[PDB]
Design an enzyme around this catalytic site. Sequence first.
Site, mmCIF file in Angstrom:
data_model
loop_
_atom_site.group_PDB
_atom_site.id
_atom_site.type_symbol
_atom_site.label_atom_id
_atom_site.label_comp_id
_atom_site.label_asym_id
_atom_site.label_seq_id
_atom_site.Cartn_x
_atom_site.Cartn_y
_atom_site.Cartn_z
ATOM 1 N N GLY A 73 -22.180 4.859 25.657
ATOM 2 C CA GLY A 73 -22.046 4.006 26.829
ATOM 3 C C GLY A 73 -23.390 3.523 27.334
ATOM 4 C CG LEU A 90 -33.331 3.109 32.619
ATOM 5 C CD1 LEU A 90 -34.388 2.241 33.324
ATOM 6 C CD2 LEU A 90 -33.224 4.463 33.292
ATOM 7 C CB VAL A 114 -29.107 5.222 30.277
ATOM 8 C CG1 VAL A 114 -30.028 6.011 31.212
ATOM 9 C CG2 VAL A 114 -28.699 6.084 29.085
ATOM 10 N N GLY A 165 -26.296 2.950 24.459
ATOM 11 C CA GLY A 165 -25.988 3.660 23.224
ATOM 12 C C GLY A 165 -24.520 3.544 22.884
ATOM 13 C CG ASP A 189 -31.405 15.215 18.791
ATOM 14 O OD1 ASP A 189 -32.180 14.797 17.874
ATOM 15 O OD2 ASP A 189 -30.643 14.475 19.437
HETATM 16 C C1 LIG Z 1 -32.981 9.074 28.274
HETATM 17 C C2 LIG Z 1 -31.862 9.065 29.326
HETATM 18 N N1 LIG Z 1 -31.972 10.201 30.284
HETATM 19 C C3 LIG Z 1 -33.017 10.258 31.192
HETATM 20 N N2 LIG Z 1 -33.831 9.197 31.244
HETATM 21 C C4 LIG Z 1 -34.874 9.251 32.061
HETATM 22 N N3 LIG Z 1 -35.758 8.184 32.170
HETATM 23 C C5 LIG Z 1 -35.787 6.953 31.472
HETATM 24 C C6 LIG Z 1 -36.728 5.993 31.892
HETATM 25 C C7 LIG Z 1 -36.823 4.759 31.280
HETATM 26 C C8 LIG Z 1 -35.955 4.423 30.241
HETATM 27 C C9 LIG Z 1 -35.001 5.342 29.845
HETATM 28 C C10 LIG Z 1 -34.895 6.582 30.453
HETATM 29 S S1 LIG Z 1 -34.035 4.701 28.519
HETATM 30 O O1 LIG Z 1 -32.667 4.601 28.904
HETATM 31 O O2 LIG Z 1 -34.255 5.461 27.351
HETATM 32 N N4 LIG Z 1 -34.799 3.220 28.442
HETATM 33 C C11 LIG Z 1 -35.868 3.127 29.462
HETATM 34 N N5 LIG Z 1 -35.151 10.297 32.853
HETATM 35 C C12 LIG Z 1 -34.378 11.370 32.817
HETATM 36 C C13 LIG Z 1 -33.287 11.407 31.968
HETATM 37 F F1 LIG Z 1 -32.533 12.520 31.919
HETATM 38 C C14 LIG Z 1 -30.788 10.979 30.485
HETATM 39 C C15 LIG Z 1 -29.907 10.790 31.523
HETATM 40 C C16 LIG Z 1 -28.750 11.543 31.636
HETATM 41 C C17 LIG Z 1 -28.413 12.522 30.719
HETATM 42 C C18 LIG Z 1 -29.318 12.756 29.676
HETATM 43 N N6 LIG Z 1 -29.342 13.595 28.607
HETATM 44 N N7 LIG Z 1 -30.455 13.407 27.840
HETATM 45 C C19 LIG Z 1 -31.145 12.450 28.395
HETATM 46 C C20 LIG Z 1 -30.460 11.950 29.524
#
Ligand SMILES: CCN(c1nc(Nc2ccc3c(c2)S(=O)(=O)NC3)ncc1F)c1cccc2[nH]ncc12
Length: 270
Positions: free
Chosen positions: A20, A14, A22, A17, A131
């Site tokens: 690692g 998804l 996501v 960084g 942050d």
């Molecule tokens: C931003 C990553 N993220 C999430 N991300 C999403 N949705 C989401 C949906 C789409 C996308 C992304 C994230 S991305 O990785 O930034 N690129 C596309 N929903 C809930 C989330 F919690 C996380 C997951 C696990 C631990 C976390 N700590 N801070 C954020 C984070």
Amino acid sequence: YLDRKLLTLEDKELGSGNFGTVKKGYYQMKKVVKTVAVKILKNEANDPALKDELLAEANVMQQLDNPYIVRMIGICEAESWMLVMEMAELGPLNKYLQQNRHVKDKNIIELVHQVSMGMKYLEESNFVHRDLAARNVLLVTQHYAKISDFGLSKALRADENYYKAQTHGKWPVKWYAPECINYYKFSSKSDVWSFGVLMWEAFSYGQKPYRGMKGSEVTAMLEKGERMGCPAGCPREMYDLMNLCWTYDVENRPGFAAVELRLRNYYYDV
Ligand SMILES: CCN(c1nc(Nc2ccc3c(c2)S(=O)(=O)NC3)ncc1F)c1cccc2[nH]ncc12
């Protein structure tokens, strides 16, 4: 601690960084399956500072319960260390606005008001986020934002309204208040300054603040009493609220209770 057999991760990534990857996944609940976003530490979580940040973030999330803060499902210790969160399908606010340039003013105000409601709750709970940027606001829908990324967050001591860092670390300086940069003191008023930068980002459709400037140049700009200009087409009332968030003196700067009131789109009493 979650059961790896109840978690399924998509092959596709998804996001990525230096920590690692996501991944999007599914977690088996009491009856339904829940869509989740999972932060997976690189190299089996061999960087101990990465592992410690994951656990510290989870420790903060376990204490929070608010509709405008991303909900943690839990930690999973398996092939690597994983932090499992409820999925906000539309992702980061800055990327969303870069890609959706026709989102209306009323809608942007609605989303930053939701962030102010989550921050009013965090302030009441005596946690500092540290942050607070548009990249850390996640969209559930185009009309529902949640605050994420509590990796730098701190629970304030019972006898102080600020967290004192030992010295400057590696920080998102363009979002930090002058007292953060100069005295390493982080309060909910410091998060209000960051919130003004986040507002500027939201009305600049995800542009980066202080474009082309070094951190030292930003500090000198702010000490001279200069501020970023009004984004093209930004409602004047919202730019005025950014300037109030960017009050230099921490005592005269509003807290989140006062900021949240200024973002309501209905009549109210103070
Ligand atoms: C931003 C990553 N993220 C999430 N991300 C999403 N949705 C989401 C949906 C789409 C996308 C992304 C994230 S991305 O990785 O930034 N690129 C596309 N929903 C809930 C989330 F919690 C996380 C997951 C696990 C631990 C976390 N700590 N801070 C954020 C984070």
